[PDB]
Each structure stands twice: as structure tokens, then as C-alpha cells.
Structure 1
């Protein structure tokens, strides 16, 4: 059986590994291949800080809460392993800050030690009057992609750089299954009007003394459109931009100013930080993740497509649960083709 995974971000790579880790034994030849037009450092995944944190509001598909819970348990059980440094994984605590009181998130029991802030803590942030504190995880995109690439490579998975024009292009050349993990670009392979870019711009700064994350939220400006500071392993991420439907992959000087002014006000110690660089990325925004089978009938025998895209601002937060689900659907295909 021939498998073609399109996409080399966290979704593409993690899905390919799961599939292989779960079916390499039971299957005759299991030939897996990855096609992507962009790799390891030029993907959306690369731009992400890698904070584990779902949206505050409840998901449209309750199944998404499980996928996140599963990703958190997976990562947590590997956090104190000697290899964690290479994945870019570690424990991190921090603030969520609000102007007004708001209900507890549904994930409050997934994170470590969830609590509300205390008056003395709130005094440090004059502009905010309510908030949370908890311990979570960071999975740094760049590093995790590299780790996944190495794991897959020693599993004899082959990588090809190419832009796919259509599913048929791939089916025509021999694929039995196609796993579609194309992110914000999925619309180019099949009409999906529900799918939109949530453009975001972030800054890398050098401020080793920052040990906590600080996320702020403001309903007037919307999700991830208010200042945030996220320490990485070497560098610190500064953000605050979420523009729906903007496809411009270019650092905008005015957005740069919004980041810098917003973050310095939150944390004045940043005034003396060193700016290492800036990048722009596209959040695959969709009312819910498209994780489903589609059979592509092409005359005699047809080929199987598994869609896995539309993880918006929570692809790292949820990837692993999604990969198991994709692996689960792949399994259904095997028994249908009678090969359990």
C-alpha cells in the first residue's frame, strides 16, 4: 500500500509518524512519502512559540477537547525525559490577564495547578483587573519539526519538495491513500470557504530574564489580538496580531509597532531587549478542524483521501490527538480493503 502525506508542518509530520508507528508491522509493503513545497524552517509551525493553550470559548466539536487533553498527556509524560531538549519541550508557568471577570476555561483541569490571580499579583499589571495563573508546556515548532524529520527519516520515510496541483495528480501516479495536511493552503486543492487565514506577526527578542508567559485578552480586539509575551528556550516571542483574511506574508512596520508598544507597556523591562528578528505566519482558521475521509472516485478503482487541516491558533496544542484520529481513520480503510 502506497501512502502520500502532503504537508510538512506539525500536522503532516506527526500524522505520518503515527501511521507508520501503528501499521508498519501489520502491512505488506507500507510505503510512505511526504510531499511539501515548504520545509522545516519556512512553515507556519516554525513561526509558533509553541505554547500549549486552547481557545477560551468552547470548541464547536466536543471531540477537540479530547484531542487537546491527549496532546497534553503525551507531552507531559515526555517532559522530564533526557531527550526533551531536542523536541524543544519544557514546563512553563504564566499569566492570563483580563479587564473584567470571566468564566473558567473548560481545560482548567488539564493544565497544572490552575488558579485565579491574587490582589498583589494584579498590582503588577495596572491595566488589568482579573486573571489566571497556571503551569503549561511549550513545544517549540522549529525544534519539534526537526526531531520529527529525524524520527521519520530513520523510519525510511522519503521526503520530496514539490507543489501539488491536485489530488488526481497524486492518485494518477500510484497512491492508494492521500493524507491532506496543507494548512491555510488547503483551499487550493478543494474549495473550502469555511477556511481563512488568520495572519499573525511575531517578534523574537533577547530577554533571558523573562521566566513566565503573559497573555492578555480583550474582547474589543478579539482572540490573539492583544499583547503577549512567550519565553522560548533561547529567545522570547512577542505578539498581538490576528487579521482574518489577510494573505500578506510580509512583516508590516505598523504591526511591528503594535507588538513593541503593547509589550513594553505590559512589561517595561523589555524596553532594553535586543530584537533578533520578525516573522509572519497564517493561522489556518476554520470553525472546526476538518478531520475526515473522502473517497475520490476516478472511474474503475478510486483512491482514498484523509483530510486533516484547519487547526487555527491551536495546531501544536492539538496535533497529537489529531494524528491518532487520522491513524484511526487510516485503520478503517485497511479493514474495508480487507487487510486487518
Structure 2
């Protein structure tokens, strides 16, 4: 069966893998290919802060929290193996600062060791008045992508520089199924005003002494508009913006400073950190994730699509969960074809 996964961000890959991993030898032939106009280091995924942490607010389609939970476990499960950092994974602990008290996140129990910070702790940051502490995981985009890639590759999945113009295209081509994991740019293949770019610029900097993440929150300014600092496998990511509907893909000096000054302020020692890079990306913002099946008639032949997009600022945090669901639907699709 000809399957075509469009997009090679964390979503496309995991998904592809997951499907193949689950059905390769459940169905004999099973042909998977991945088309994408961008591959790492060019995906949005490549620019994510790399932390597992869903938004504070309980998800609209409640199953999302499961996907999140499932993603976290899967990840955690790897922590212990030798390859975990080779997958781009590692545990990290850190803070979430606030200016006023606030309700515990629904994921309070998915993460390890969640607890409200004490005053002494808070004294470590004079701006904030309230916050939490917990340990979690770093799952780095680029590395994970490459891992995922090698995995798929050895599994025989094939990749292709392609810019799909239409699903039609792909279908006239031969795809029995098509899995749309085109991120923000999904709208192009089929409009979806729900979907929008959540622009975010960041700065990578070299400062090995920071071992914990620190994420501040301005309830007014909106989420991820406040300074944040996230240690990674080697560099640290300085961050602070999330602009909806903004599509400029260039790093802007203004933002650069607002990030630089804000973090520097939050974390004073940053004064000596050396900047090694700046990047900007589009969070595939959407009220909810679109992950559902859709049949498409072209001539006398039907073609199956399965959407998986709009993971906003938690694409990594919940990638796996969805990847599973798709496989699930994908399966139903096979049942209907009678295998």
C-alpha cells in the first residue's frame, strides 16, 4: 500500500515511524515515502526550545492531555538507555515563575516532582511572586529529527525533496493514503483559517553553567511572550516571543533585544554568555489540533487523508500521542480496505 507522509518535522517523522513500526509486517508490502520541501535543520521543529511542557491551560479536546501524557511516558521510558541523548533526550529540572498565584497545571502529575516553590527559592528571582518547580525532559528538535530519520531510513522508509502542490497531486500520483503533517503551511494544501503562525524568535547562547530551565509568565502579555531560558544538550536557548499571525521569517533586532534584555535581567550572569545563534519559527497555532481522517474523491478513485497538524507550541511535548492515534486511524483505513 502506498502511503505518503507530507512533512518531515517532528510530526511527520514520528508519525511515519509509528505507522511503519506498527504495520509494517501486519500488512506485507507497505510502501512508505516522505515528501517534504524542508528537512532538518530547516523545520519548525528544528527551532523549538526543546522542552516537554504543555501549556498551562487545560486543552479543549481533552484527549490532548492524554497524548501529552502518553508522549511523556514514552519519552521517560527511554531515560535509562545509553542512547537517550543520542535521541536528543535528557532530564532537566526547572522553574515556572509568575507574578500572582495560579492554579496548578493539569500536567502537574505527568511531570516528575512537581511542587510549588518556597520563598527562599523565589528569592532567587525577585521579580516573580509565585511559581512551580518540577523536573522534566529536554527533547531536542534537530537531534530527534536526525534520530527519527536514521531510524526510518534503516526501516526502509524513503525521503523526497518535494513541494506538494496539492493532495490531488499526490493522489494522481499513486498514494492510497496521505498523511498531512505540513505544520503551519498546511493551509496551503487546503484552507484552514483556524491555523495561524505563532511566531517566535530565540537566541542560542553558550552558558554551560545554567543547568535548569526557567520560564516566566505574564498573564497579560500572553504565553511565551515572557523571557524564558532553556538549557539544551549543548547550548542554552534564550526566548521570549509568540506573535500570532506574524509571518516574517527573519530574526528582528527588536525582538532580539527584548529577549536578550529580559533574560539577562532574569538571569544576570547571562552577562557573560556568548551568543552563538538566533532563529525564528512559526508555531502552528490552532484552537485545537487537527488530527482526523478525510476521504478525497479524484476521478473514479477515492484517496485517504489523515491530518495531523496545529500543535502550536507543544508539538514536541505531544508528538508521540498523536503519532499513535494516526496509526490507529490508519489501521481502520486498512480494515476498510480489508487489509
Please state which band the TM-score falls in when normalised by the shorter chain: over 0.9
Once residues 146 and 317 of structure 2 are traced to their aligned partners in structure 1, the CA distance between those partners, rounded to angstroms, is: 18
Pairs within 5 Å for 1:56-95: 56-95=56-95
- CA deviations 1:71-112 (Å, max 9, x no partner) are 000000101100112111000000100000011111101000
Partner of residue 131, structure 1: 131
d(CA) in 1 for partners of 2:56 and 2:164? 35
Q: Does 1:248 align with 2:245?
A: no
Equivalent residue number for residue 283 of structure 2: 283
3-state SS in 2 of match to 1:279: strand
- Report the secondary structure of 1:309's partner residue: coil
Aligned pair count reads 339
Distance (whole Å) between structure 1 residues aligned to residue 180 and residue 125 of structure 2? 44
Q: How many angstroms does 1:301 deviate by?
A: 2.2
**Aligned pair 1:32/2:20, yes or no?**
no
- 1: CA distance, partners of 2:40 / 2:6: 14
Distance 1:86 1:202 in 2: 24
Looking at structure 2, the residues matched to 301 and 44 of structure 1 have their Cα atoms a distance apart, in angstroms, of 34
Deviation at 1:49? Answer: 2.1
Under a length normalisation based on structure 2, what TM-score does the superposition of the two structures give?
Answer: 0.99
For residue 302 of structure 1, give the secondary structure of its aligned residue in structure 2: strand
Q: Which runs of 5+ in 2 are unaligned?
A: none
State the Cα distance separating 1:173 from its structure 2 match: 1.0
The match for 1:15 is 15
Q: Secondary structure at the match of 1:126?
A: coil
- Partner residue, 1:153: 153
Moved beyond 2 Å, runs of 4+:
none
1:187-336 pair list within 5 angstroms: 187-336=187-336
- Which residue number in structure 1 is paired with residue 52 of structure 2? 52
Q: Distance in 2 between matches of 1:241 and 1:181?
A: 24
Whole-Å Cα distance in 2 between the matches of residues 143 and 178 of structure 1? 26
Task: Return the alpha-carbon distance in structure 1 between the equivalents of residues 59 and 84 of structure 2.
Answer: 30
Tell me the CA shift for residue 219 of structure 1: 1.2
What CA distance in whole angstroms lies between the structure 1 residues aligned with 2:144 and 2:330? Answer: 24
Q: Any idea what the Cα deviations from partners look like across 1:185-235, whole Å, max 9, x if unmatched?
A: 000000100000000001000000001000000011100000000001110
In 1, Cα distance between equivalents of 2:141 and 2:14? 12
Question: What is the CA RMSD across the aligned residues, in angstroms?
Answer: 0.6
Q: Residue 337 of structure 1 corresponds to which residue in structure 2? A: 337
1-structure distance, mates of 2:299, 2:168: 12
**TM-score, normalised to structure 1's length?**
0.99
CA distance in 1, matches of 2:178, 2:316: 22
Alignment deviations for residues 303-327 of structure 1 (CA, whole Å, 9 cap, x no partner)? 1000000000000000000000000
CA separation in 1, counterparts of 2:177 and 2:47? 29
What's the secondary structure of 2:292's corresponding residue? strand
Partners of 1:299 and 1:147 in 2: CA distance? 39
**Pairwise CA distance, 1:293:** 0.4
SS at match of 1:259: helix
